[PDB]
Write a protein that binds this ligand. Structure first.
Ligand SMILES: Nc1ncnc2c1ncn2[C@@H]1O[C@H](COP(=O)(O)NC(=O)[C@@H](N)Cc2ccc(O)cc2)[C@@H](O)[C@H]1O
Ligand SMILES: Nc1ncnc2c1ncn2[C@@H]1O[C@H](COP(=O)(O)NC(=O)[C@@H](N)Cc2ccc(O)cc2)[C@@H](O)[C@H]1O
Ligand SMILES: [Mg+2]
Ligand SMILES: [Mg+2]
Lengths: 339, 339
RNA sequence: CUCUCGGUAGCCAAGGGAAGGCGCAAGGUAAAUCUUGAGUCGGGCGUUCGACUCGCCCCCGGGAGACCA
RNA sequence: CUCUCGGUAGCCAAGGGAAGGCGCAAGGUAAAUCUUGAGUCGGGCGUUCGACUCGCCCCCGGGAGACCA
């Protein structure tokens, strides 16, 4: 149903650009929306990745044609974050990490498409379109567009300017109506909207998830050891009463709640905190806002919040950790992709 | 003979970078030198092009494997100087112009190879190497390298930065020992020398011809009408005695002399000037330096120099003009490439 | 290619017998004030009793220059 | 996408009844001094007696902004 589908597609997002495009596809064209989410097989994925994964689940639930682009070439072009022979293994590592997360939160992944960027990004039609776009995008616009995505270094490389053009062309070459990513992709997303019509290609809608802030070593690896989860959580900034600058609270806000909501309805939020009897007994918060207000009113202390978040993160990571220990290909990709 | 060959290859050049490479090819490897000259099918070629053409003749005479690269894609990437469908016709126009010049100065062109840049520049191996080089060349270096070749505009396009990288890779993909161009190519040439070894490819030698200065509408089209040649020559700067800033003198220096030398030996320079009896009779200068000294000593006036240069340019252009009027494909390429 | 400035703890660095500043970890959660502790000279070959320092060759990075403008 | 500044002779531009500056062409070769001549408002729809000027919609370019920094 085109209204229900639209509701599922846009829920929990910070920003939707060109919703009319999605609405036209669902209501006028009367077909399933084609979208993709792209990731550069760069460093090891962290707990921040849970946010896009919940959205992928919403998309599949809505009947969308969902593709994950393993942007291997992009990983090379971003300041050589992934080099030459290592990127292929990283692409696999990413593929299996993504599949483990989604399976860990009970999402059926049969209809999820995986495309490796180099499988079309080295064809003549694509190269020609790089040239065409490079003729339309200023040096200053390509630099600005990639500013919050491409690593900014003292002596910037030409690769950094090609990166955002290629991300825009991918929309066309993947044949989608829509691209999904974090709000940190906005500048590239807007570049795509402004420039693809100049090439003869249609404008695409854009879906953006909120970013889960750092904790400050300020992210948690998706295969982090329980004791390392303990340490990273402990060192996180946490002022009594401060809810505005609270990485742990925001983690619960943007990761725990949506994963729990993936049971169903905005009516399942149960956060257990194993509080020591000395400072009151254990407590289970039944809504996020209640948990938020508990902290602001200084009823929930920072150390108590740390206990609850570490236990919940450890809960989430367990099945991903277990899939890693059971899968040798996953283990091989880890070893060869990160020497 | 490796010494004679080297003499022919380097004669009349302003600068030779890495002569040891050429010497190694001719003396140690004991084979013919492989080189290329590249041109972007951009505006209509002018009388400046005579200089590279005399060098091509020297190269073929030396036994070199000579390729002219019709850099169609480059013509597009230089501020869209040649667009989309027009460039193909311009490439042909350039091919036939080049062949007419060389035939007009009695150079056998059978062994001259022509390659269209797009015939390999859109292959996956090339695209991959663009990415590799873009990872090694800074944004600042790509900008500087193309500064005197790529048109500098108020709002520079990304295409301008890709241009010089592609010119460097062409050396490898054309499988040459050496690239020939004007001294205005030096910055790109040096970029190629500094960066190709990083990719695993060998350093190439570089041959650079001097530039024939402007006359100041300050260049003469290779199909310029006699009366238009008259006008452009007349308006050229020419101070009595000034040989240091004298576009016409420099034209004789770098175009007339080498074309005449293509009879043979540095011992044929005959410049006829149809001087009106009022200011002395006609005069034929037997060496350039004598003609130069005549002007410095104020024995040869600016208007007299204008007469001689216009007649000589008209002499050179005649057979090219005649080939254009006899060749319909050449005529078609002109009409469709320059609407 | 030519000139020029650089390379010293993860980062910013001062300098013929290894300063600081940032970061790191310690010291009902963390941070921030504070006071303490851990953490070697791009490479080679020389000259010297002894080289981070002096001589040479090399490797890497920045800036500029490189017909004309 | 949001905000903001622009679009007027080839180029730089000042501005409810088309300034300059550069360039161009003229005025024993040319240039340079000099003095003279040629050369209409991004588009549409309105409001008005009359629009370059006022109102709206559009098209094009620059700069910035766009979670956080
Ligand atoms: N902490 C976080 N919270 C929420 N989301 C996070 C967090 N970290 C990364 N993400 C989100 O997960 C996605 C993958 O991150 P990434 O860094 O691997 N990907 C990129 O930077 C993309 N530029 C890769 C890409 C390449 C080509 C394309 O056509 C499309 C995309 C990004 O869209 C990002 O917004
Ligand atoms: N007035 C002149 N005097 C002497 N030579 C002149 C003159 N004008 C152009 N030339 C010389 O003729 C050659 C062709 O000029 P062009 O402007 O068409 N070519 C370029 O700018 C080259 N960048 C085109 C190229 C592209 C890819 C390559 O792999 C190699 C080359 C250039 O090497 C130039 O030095
Ligand atoms: Mg990544
Ligand atoms: Mg050209």
């Amino acid at each position: 149903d085109p209204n229900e589908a639209f509701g599922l597609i846009t829920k929990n997002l910070q920003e939707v650009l060109n919703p009319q495009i999605i609405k036209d596809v669902l209501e006028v064209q009367k077909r399933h929306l084609k979208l993709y989410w792209g990731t550069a097989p760069t460093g090891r994925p962290h707990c921040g990745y849970f946010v896009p994964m919940t959205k992928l689940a919403d998309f599949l639930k809505a009947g969308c044609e969902v593709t994950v682009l393993l942007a291997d070439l992009h990983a090379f072009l971003d300041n050589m974050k992934a080099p030459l022979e290592v990127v292929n293994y990283r692409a696999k590592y990413y593929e299996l990490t993504i599949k483990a997360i989604l399976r860990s939160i009970n999402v059926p992944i049969e209809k999820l498409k995986f495309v490796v960027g180099s499988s079309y990004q080295l064809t003549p039609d694509y190269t020609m379109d790089i040239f065409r776009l490079s003729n339309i995008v200023s040096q200053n616009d390509a630099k600005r567009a990639g500013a919050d995505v491409v690593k900014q270094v003292a002596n910037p490389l030409l690769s950094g300017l090609i990166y955002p053009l290629m991300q825009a062309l991918d929309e066309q070459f993947l044949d989608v109506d829509c691209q999904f990513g974090g709000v940190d992709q906005r500048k590239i997303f807007v570049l795509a909207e402004e420039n693809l019509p100049s090439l003869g290609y249609k404008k695409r809608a854009h879906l953006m998830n909120p970013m889960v802030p750092g904790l400050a070593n300020s992210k948690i690896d998706l295969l982090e050891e329980p004791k390392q989860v303990k340490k990273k959580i402990n060192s996180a900034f946490c002022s009594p009463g401060n809810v505005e600058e609270n990485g742990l609270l925001s983690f619960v806000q943007y990761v725990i709640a949506p994963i729990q909501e993936l049971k169903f309805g905005t009516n399942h939020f149960e956060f257990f905190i194993d509080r020591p009897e000395k400072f009151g007994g254990p407590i289970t918060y039944k809504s996020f806002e209640e948990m938020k207000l508990a902290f602001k009113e200084e009823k929930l202390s920072p150390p108590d919040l740390k206990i609850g978040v570490a236990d919940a993160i450890n809960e989430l990571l367990e099945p991903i950790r277990q899939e890693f220990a059971n899968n040798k290909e996953f283990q091989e990709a880890s070893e060869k992709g990160y020497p």
